[PDB]
């Protein structure tokens, strides 16, 4: 029924850009383009024309796009928008769209559009902002189509997708400009920005310039191989694609911490003295303990995060004994270099928009312009908010995954300022309604509403990325009394949503008290089946925290990493060179007379 | 000691002349595009001068660091007040910038030099007539004056090259040439000490003379091409010898061997790198070559 992909099918995407309010715009677009068409050439149609005619007309459009009058510019942009749509048959308009878009790329529309977008940047109701809207439309469409085929023109999409993520705009990638728009909106000092389209465009550009979940898994595999780590035990995406609602598909894992803890327990119990953070000394223990140690250490799973943290503390130990490293400028890295200055404001703004768009800063300004009209406007506003939530959740999840893959401390620096803004209680509050209705909300006019369900799965995946292996945050998950909310969301018959709810229930079932375990077993059975099992884990029989302290320690770690890798100017003030070159040489009468008379 | 750091690639045709600001980190580059550009420190220019017609040949900076004089094909000289650093390159045009215009010899200005007395400047042309100027009083000399320059230790004495193969020295208040010393002679410079004066021959022999008897104290073969330009350290230690071999060399005023050699320029035609310019406060070196590619090493 539901097929979790990085994005819904192309037709649903295109339908999920225009509000049900800005319908008539389409007419205008044609009634604009056609008219100019009529004057440029006569008695022909755009479809019956040929290649160089199309290219000439496109160059004419780009030329006209630089008049100094906002009104004529709006007219020309509406024409370009109609071109980008091209419009009969849905497959026909799809092909013609792909064609027209690659044409507009070839002529070079995108840079002109970006310049005009800056122009509009440096300056209620829908018509409050049409031009921007119009402009944004085109850009989205372009990216959409270009990425809709990102799975001839191969060189075209490659060079495009490469330049879109390259710092060519104020020396910052396009996503940085979109983040700037979002911030300038949430600050209340730009109350006219259309936010659904800005957010959608940011999502799609992050997607195409960083890669979806499949390219994510592939890059993960390559970075594993490069670092020498053994390959991943499963194909997580496939395993989850081959689950069901409510087998043991997950090969068990055991992190080093568990090995050390178990070994020290055994040492205390059999040797009368603990050793401390050593996992090779096993000689005095009985053979049935060597067996367990071997079984553990043969099921060990060392992720990129551990080795990266190790390399980080290493660099910090020996700074200038060759420790100075080069970092690849993969698009995730450049995007992080761009975001780093003002990340926390970005995160706070995203979360504010989210909370304003939860089912229950005037975000609906974009869509607002008979009882039938009131009903249509209501369903339209709900759709607007649904799309906003989908876009924001997807952006956050993609950023989290790609940063963690790029370097763990970037993921931590994002997650810290994401939780400081109370993202955990925010998400939980988002889940404190009748989730089933939200998922089956058929809020669209020409089962599972793929939009809402995708967004909910993403919110759960995020919440998991936030609270995992961090005891304080798990205790936070307990404090807000999440369990009755999670196991109520467990009713959705989807498999991935169930899996990601259980990923949390299992992580907090130890602190929920025996009685709770004794009361809820169906959920414990589900946790048994679905979630991966860790060896020597004690969720099923658990017995049982300095939040601010653990935070302020992780914060220090993060800031050390950031200062080392992105403040090379000030970095290491102890050891500095001195310019021995002769730039220094140029860098009261007695003082002459006597000094000369010296000899 | 000197590694490439900048390549000021925004001029189309060959950059004939270039000179560094005394204190600011700013470089002025005159090309054959009839336009010259000021840069402040993969870098983009900060100003472009739209007043000269015909390719620019020679350039000099006001030693105070506020005015620039240029003279090339148009047989005229322009005198701008350079905008200070941190100005906007894409700004409103200011017509006052071209404050000064000098109309003199009817021929192209091949040699330009500024005077440390802050009231005069030497302009030699292909006309055969060197002119001393005051920014309206001009003292002319009717002696092929390829290169004519201003001795620094005494502003009274000045030098003059010639396409013959010799160079003549003369005075300021006398206009009477003192002595000659010994074929094209591309570029002549004057040491910041009175006697030493360096010349570059078409025969690839850098030669040295004194302002008191013009003795051929030293003639070292420099490169495999006619040495086009010379540049003198602001404290007289090293010496840039730009040659048509697309190979600039930092010689030392004591050790006259290849103390350092950098080679990065293209032989766009029979002519190669035009000019070389030291700094005076920041120790940068810039080279303006035939392919319009100003290299800057730090």
């Amino acid at each position: 029924e539901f097929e979790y992909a990085d994005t819904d099918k192309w037709a649903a995407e295109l339908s999920e850009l225009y509000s049900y309010t800005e319908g008539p715009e389409f007419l205008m677009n044609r009634k604009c383009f056609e008219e100019d068409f009529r004057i440029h050439v006569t008695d022909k149609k755009w479809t019956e024309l040929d290649t160089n005619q199309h290219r000439t007309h496109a160059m004419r459009l780009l030329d006209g796009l630089e008049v100094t009058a906002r009104e004529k510019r709006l007219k020309v942009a509406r024409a370009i928008l109609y071109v980008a749509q091209g419009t009969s048959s849905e497959a026909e308009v799809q092909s013609w769209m792909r064609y027209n878009i690659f044409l507009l790329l070839e002529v070079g529309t995108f840079n002109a559009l970006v310049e005009l977008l800056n122009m509009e940047i440096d300056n209620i109701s829908l018509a409050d902002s049409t031009d921007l809207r119009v402009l944004l439309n085109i850009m989205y469409l372009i990216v959409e189509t270009v990425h809709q085929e990102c799975e001839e023109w191969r060189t075209m999409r490659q060079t495009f997708r490469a330049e879109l993520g390259s710092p060519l705009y104020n020396n910052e990638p396009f996503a940085i400009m979109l983040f700037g728009m979002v911030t300038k909106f949430c600050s209340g000092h730009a109350p006219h920005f259309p936010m659904k389209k800005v957010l959608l465009l940011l999502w799609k550009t992050v997607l195409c310039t960083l890669g979806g979940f499949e390219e994510l898994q592939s890059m993960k595999a390559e970075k594993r191989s490069i670092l020498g780590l053994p390959p991943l035990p499963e194909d997580s995406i496939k395993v989850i694609r081959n689950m069901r609602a409510a087998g043991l598909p997950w090969a068990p894992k055991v992190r080093e911490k568990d090995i050390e803890m178990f070994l020290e327990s055994s040492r205390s119990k059999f040797i009368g003295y603990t050793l401390g953070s050593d996992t090779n000394t096993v000689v005095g223990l009985p053979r049935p303990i060597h067996e367990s140690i071997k079984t553990l250490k043969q099921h060990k799973y060392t992720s990129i995060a551990e080795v990266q943290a190790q390399m980080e503390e290493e660099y910090l130990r020996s700074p200038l004994s060759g420790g100075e490293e080069e970092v690849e400028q993969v698009p995730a890295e450049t995007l992080y270099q761009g975001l780093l200055p003002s990340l926390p404001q970005y995160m706070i703004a995203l979360l504010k928009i989210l909370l304003a768009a939860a089912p229950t800063i005037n975000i609906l300004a974009d869509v607002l312009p008979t009882v039938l009209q009131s009903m249509k406007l209501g369903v339209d506003v709900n759709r607007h908010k649904e799309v906003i939530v989908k876009a924001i959740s997807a952006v956050l999840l993609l950023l989290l995954k790609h940063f963690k893959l790029n370097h763990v401390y970037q993921f931590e620096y994002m997650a810290q300022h994401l939780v400081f803004a109370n993202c955990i209680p925010l998400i939980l509050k988002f889940f404190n309604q009748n989730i089933m209705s939200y998922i089956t909300a058929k809020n669209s006019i020409s089962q599972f509403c793929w939009r809402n369900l995708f967004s909910c799965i993403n919110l759960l995946r995020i919440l998991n990325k936030l609270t995992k292996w961090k005891h304080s945050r798990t205790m936070m998950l307990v404090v807000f009394k999440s369990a009755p909310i999670l196991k109520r969301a467990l009713k959705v018959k989807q498999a991935m949503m169930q899996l990601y709810v259980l990923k949390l229930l299992k992580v907090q079932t130890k602190y929920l008290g025996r009685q709770w375990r004794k009361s809820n077993m169906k959920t414990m059975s589900a946790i048994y089946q679905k979630v991966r099992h860790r060896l020597n884990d004690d969720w099923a029989y658990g017995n049982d925290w300095d939040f601010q302290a653990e935070e302020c320690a992780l914060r220090a770690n993060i800031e050390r990493f950031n200062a080392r890798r992105y403040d090379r100017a000030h970095s290491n003030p102890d050891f500095l060179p001195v310019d021995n070159c002769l730039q220094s040489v140029l860098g009261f009468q007695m003082n002459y007379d006597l000094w000369l008379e010296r000899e | 000691t000197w590694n490439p750091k900048y390549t000021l690639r925004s001029h189309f045709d060959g950059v004939r002349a270039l000179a560094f600001h005394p204190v600011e980190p700013v470089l002025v580059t005159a090309s054959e595009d009839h336009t010259l550009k000021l840069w402040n420190l993969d870098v983009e220019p900060i100003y472009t001068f739209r007043a000269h017609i015909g390719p620019v040949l020679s350039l000099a900076i006001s030693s105070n660091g506020e005015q620039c004089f240029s003279g090339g094909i148009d047989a005229t000289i322009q005198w701008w007040n350079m905008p200070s650093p941190s100005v906007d390159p894409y700004d409103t045009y200011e017509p006052n910038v071209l404050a000064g215009t000098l109309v003199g010899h009817t021929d192209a200005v091949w040699g330009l030099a500024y005077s440390g007395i802050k009231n005069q400047l030497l302009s030699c042309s292909a006309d055969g007539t060197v002119r001393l100027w005051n920014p309206p009083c001009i003292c002319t000399y009717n002696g092929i004056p390829t290169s004519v320059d201003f001795i620094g230790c005494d502003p009274a004495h000045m030098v003059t090259s010639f396409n013959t193969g010799s160079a003549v020295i003369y005075d300021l208040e006398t206009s009477q040439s003192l002595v000659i010393l010994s074929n094209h002679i591309n570029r002549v410079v004057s040491h910041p000490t009175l006697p030493v004066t360096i010349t570059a021959h078409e025969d690839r022999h850098i030669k040295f003379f004194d302002n008191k008897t013009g003795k051929m104290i030293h003639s070292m073969v420099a490169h495999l091409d006619a040495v086009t330009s010379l540049a003198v350290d602001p404290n007289g230690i090293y010496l840039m010898s730009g040659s048509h071999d697309c190979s600039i060399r930092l010689w030392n005023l004591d050790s006259k061997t290849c103390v350092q050699e950098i080679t990065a320029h293209r032989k766009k035609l029979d002519e190669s790198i035009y000019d070389v310019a030291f700094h005076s406060s920041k120790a940068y070196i810039a080279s303006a070559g035939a392919d319009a590619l100003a290299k800057v090493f730090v």
Binding site: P577, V578, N580, C581, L582, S584, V585, L596 | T193, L194, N235, G236, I237, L253, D254
Partner: peptide, 25 residues
């Protein structure tokens, strides 16, 4: 760094030696 300082000092003393010889005349 110390070697670079040494070379700069050698340069400066060569400068002063030349300047004083020039002053001699």
């Amino acid at each position: 760094e110390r070697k670079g300082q040494e070379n700069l000092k050698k340069d400066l003393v060569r400068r002063i030696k030349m300047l004083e010889y020039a002053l001699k005349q």
